Amino acid sequence: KLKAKPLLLQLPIGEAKTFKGVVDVVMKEKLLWNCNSNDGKDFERKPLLEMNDPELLKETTEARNALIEQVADLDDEFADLVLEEFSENFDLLPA
Amino acid sequence: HFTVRLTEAKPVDKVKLIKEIKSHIQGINLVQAKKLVESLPQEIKANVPKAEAEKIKAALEAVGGTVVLE
Numbered sequence: 001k002l003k004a005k006p007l008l009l010q011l012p013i014g015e016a017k018t019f020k021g022v023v024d025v026v027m028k029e030k031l032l033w034n035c036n037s038n039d040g041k042d043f044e045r046k047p048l049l050e051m052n053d054p055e056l057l058k059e060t061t062e063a064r065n066a067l068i069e070q071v072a073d074l075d076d077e078f079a080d081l082v083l084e085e086f087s088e089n090f091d092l093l094p095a
Numbered sequence: 096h097f098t099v100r101l102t103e104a105k106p107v108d109k110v111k112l113i114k115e116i117k118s119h120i121q122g123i124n125l126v127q128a129k130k131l132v133e134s135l136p137q138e139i140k141a142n143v144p145k146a147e148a149e150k151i152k153a154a155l156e157a158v159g160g161t162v163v164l165e
Contacts, residue, residue, distance in 0.1 A: 069125055073117060079125075080110035087126045 007070055011063060023048075023056065025063045026095055030056070065090055096142045099152060100163045104132055108159025115158050119151055 013021040013030075021032040029047045033039035048057055068090070072079040086092040104112055109132075116128045116139070123131070131137055143151070152162040 072125055073114065076110050076114060079113055082125065083109060083113055083129050083132075087129050090126075 005070070005074075007067060008063060009067070011059065023060055025060065025067050028060055028064065028094075061090075068092065097145060097148045098141045098165050099139050099143060099148055100165060101132070101135055101137065101139055101155070102161040102163055104135060104161070105159045111158040112155075112160055115155055115160075119154070 009025050011023040011025070012019050013023070020034070021030055023030045027047075029045050030049065031043040031045065033043065035041075048060060051057070068082065072082045082092065112132055113125070113128050116132065117123065117125065120128070120139075131139070140151070148164060152164060155162045
């Protein structure tokens with residue numbers, strides 16, 4: 001009902017009072033917040049818990065594939081680059 | 096009904112062909128479309144009506160594609 005195609009870039013951990021962190025799509029990392037003020041003065045970067053959570057890994061890679069598909073269908077030059085170099089990789093490049 | 100065939104893909108229209116294929120098939124993915132476009136000669140659609148075949152061939156040739164009908 002807004003009539004605009006969105007590009008999801010982040011996946012929350014929880015919804016109802018359990019949203020304690022986010023998972024980035026372009027960077028394949030998780031950001032956590034455990035404090036009251038400034039939530040640790042920074043965000044804690046432990047990328048996908050070092051290849052340990054299969055569900056998180058699968059969701060993150062599926063989100064990355066969806067984002068890549070969206071951006072490639074939208075832009076033509078990026079579509080050309082995906083066509084030319086990173087087709088079967090599905091993991092083009094970090095950032 | 097008619098059948099459509101993509102004969103050759105132009106080196107400079109490689110970028111524009113894939114988007115048209117994606118918008119025309121409506122059921123294919125990006126890498127599958129790329130394999131379709133790199134595996135010429137290869138069929139695109141079959142048992143397509145005449146008007147739809149004309150529209151898709153016109154849209155495919157306006158972006159730099161070699162299209163034939165059988």
